[PDB]
Amino acid sequence: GTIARTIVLQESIGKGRFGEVWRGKWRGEEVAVKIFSSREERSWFREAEIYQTVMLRHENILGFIAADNKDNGTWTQLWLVSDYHEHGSLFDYLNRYTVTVEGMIKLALSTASGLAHLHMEIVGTQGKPAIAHRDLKSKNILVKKNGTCCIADLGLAVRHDSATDTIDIAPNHRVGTKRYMAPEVLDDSINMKHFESFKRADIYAMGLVFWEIARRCSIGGIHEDYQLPYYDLVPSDPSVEEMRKVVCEQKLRPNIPNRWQSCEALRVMAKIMRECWYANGAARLTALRIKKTLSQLSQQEGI
Numbered sequence: 290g291t292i293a294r295t296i297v298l299q300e301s302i303g304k305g306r307f308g309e310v311w312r313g314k315w316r317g318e319e320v321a322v323k324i325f326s327s328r329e330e331r332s333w334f335r336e337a338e339i340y341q342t343v344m345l346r347h348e349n350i351l352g353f354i355a356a357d358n359k360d361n362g363t364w365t366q367l368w369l370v371s372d373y374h375e376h377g378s379l380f381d382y383l384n385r386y387t388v389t390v391e392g393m394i395k396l397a398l399s400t401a402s403g404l405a406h407l408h409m410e411i412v413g414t415q416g417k418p419a420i421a422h423r424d425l426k427s428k429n430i431l432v433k434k435n436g437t438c439c440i441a442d443l444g445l446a447v448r449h450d451s452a453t454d455t456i457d458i459a460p461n462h463r464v465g466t467k468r469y470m471a472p473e474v475l476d477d478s479i480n481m482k483h484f485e486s487f488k489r490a491d492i493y494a495m496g497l498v499f500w501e502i503a504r505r506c507s508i509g510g511i512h513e514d515y516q517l518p519y520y521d522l523v524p525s526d527p528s529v530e531e532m533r534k535v536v537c538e539q540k541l542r543p544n545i546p547n548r549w550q551s552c553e554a555l556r557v558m559a560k561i562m563r564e565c566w567y568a569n570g571a572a573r574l575t576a577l578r579i580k581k582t583l584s585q586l587s588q589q590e591g592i
Contacts, residue, residue, distance in 0.1 A: 293359035293368045296322060302377075307332040307444065312373060319373040320354060324366050333367040335458075336444035340369070344417035349403025351431060351441040371441075379438055379498070380427035384515045387507040390554045391592050392436060396502050397558065398583040399437035400430060404495055405576035407440060408488050410451055418457075419449040421487030424465040425494040427501050427517075449484040456484055467532050468519055469494040472568045475533040479570075489570030495579070496565025500543045503558045511548065518543045542566045557586050 295315060302310040308325035325333035333356070339345075340353035352372035359366045376382050379396065388396065404425070411417035422429075422440065429442035445464050448457040460481050463474055471490035473479040479486050497518040504513035519527070521544070522535045535541050545562065549555040561582065564574045574582075 290357070292355045292357040292370060293366070296320065296368075296370065298322060305442075308367075308369075313370070315354070315370065319375075321371045321373045323369040323371070325369075327365050327367070330367060332444060333369065336369055339420070339443040339446045339448070340371075342417065342420065342448065343415055344411050345420075347403060347406040349399045349437065349439050350406060351439045351443070372439075374431040374433050374439070376432035376434070378428050378441075379430040379432050379502075382432040383427065383501055383505045386505070387512050388502070388505050390506060390508060390552065391590060393502050393506040393558070394554060394583065394587050394590060394592055395436045396432070396438055397499055397561075398580065398587055400440070400495060400498060401576055401579040401583055403438065403440040404491060405580045407446075408491070408576050410449070412451075419451065419484065419488070421447050421449075421484065422491050422494075423447060423460075423487060424469075425491050425498065426466050426469045427498050428466075430498065447484070447487055454484065456482070456487075463529070467527050467529055468517060468523065469497055470529070470532060470536075471570065472537045473570055475529060476537045486570060488575075489573050492565050492573045492576060492579075493570070495576070496562045496573075497543065499558055499562050499565070500545075503549065503555060503562075506555060506558075508552060508555075513546065537568075540568070554586060554590065557582065 296313045298311045298313045300312040302312055307329050308323050311322045311324065313320045313322040337356035354370040357368045357370065359368055407420045407422060410419040422443065423445045424442060430438050431441050432438055447460055450457065471493035474490050479490065500518055504516060506512060519535060522541060523531050545559050549559040561574065561579055567573050
């Protein structure tokens with residue numbers, strides 16, 4: 290065996306939705322190891338399945354190494370081994386630091402590039418299906434040493450078959466983090482047989498993540514403190530009903546500070562946010578369009 294047999298766990302990172310994450314050592318390198326119990330095989334298998342999708346690898350998608358089993362002599366462990374990113378999540382990174390205009394662009398553009406890749410179908414023998422995340426949030430995006438992001442936590446993802454316009458696991462129920470659920474997800478108006486609706490719901494979530502980044506953009510020593518979207522309107526761990534009353538009924542979105550009109554980069558960011566936040570998913574920007582706009586911005590700023 291070349292994987293779990295040869296890995297040594299060094300540090301507990303944390304227990305998430307399913308399983309637990311550790312920092313391990315594999316062939317002298319640091320690796321992220323997500324371990325699931327025998328009764329979590331369905332979650333482990335589905336995440337292994339998404340990460341093994343043909344042509345998935347991309348600089349802005351977490352690098353998957355292997356799936357494996359490890360028997361310690363008492364119980365079986367189901368492992369998912371991936372690249373290790375020392376900064377941890379974009380949520381941790383934005384809490385820990387402020388960012389420059391350059392830093393903000395790198396973070397936003399890389400996030401959009403990874404999402405555009407996830408969403409994009411690549412047609413061919415070695416084809417890649419279009420994939421929707423369903424749980425995009427700052428806690429599910431990692432920050433690499435080079436200051437760019439990679440999308441992680443692909444366990445809840447759905448894959449599209451374009452010839453039939455059907456989804457591989459035919460989702461029939463709401464999933465994901467309540468705070469980041471699109472208005473159509475919160476009010477259950479979403480058509481879950483329509484794959485394009487899942488892509489649009491991801492864009493709404495990315496708009497919220499962009500708002501979190503922009504708050505941390507420090508110009509002339511001026512920035513906002515770290516906050517989750519809707520910090521001002523809902524409790525921690527909000528319910529679907531608490532979110533639905535704010536997002537769907539009162540029709541509120543995170544506030545856009547007046548100061549974001551002070552420079553081109555914050556005006557471009559604020560504009561993308563508004564265009565991800567439309568209640569009508571069909572009116573939202575695509576990840577590919579956002580990538581295009583941000584790459585044009587990155588060129589002007591000389592990143």
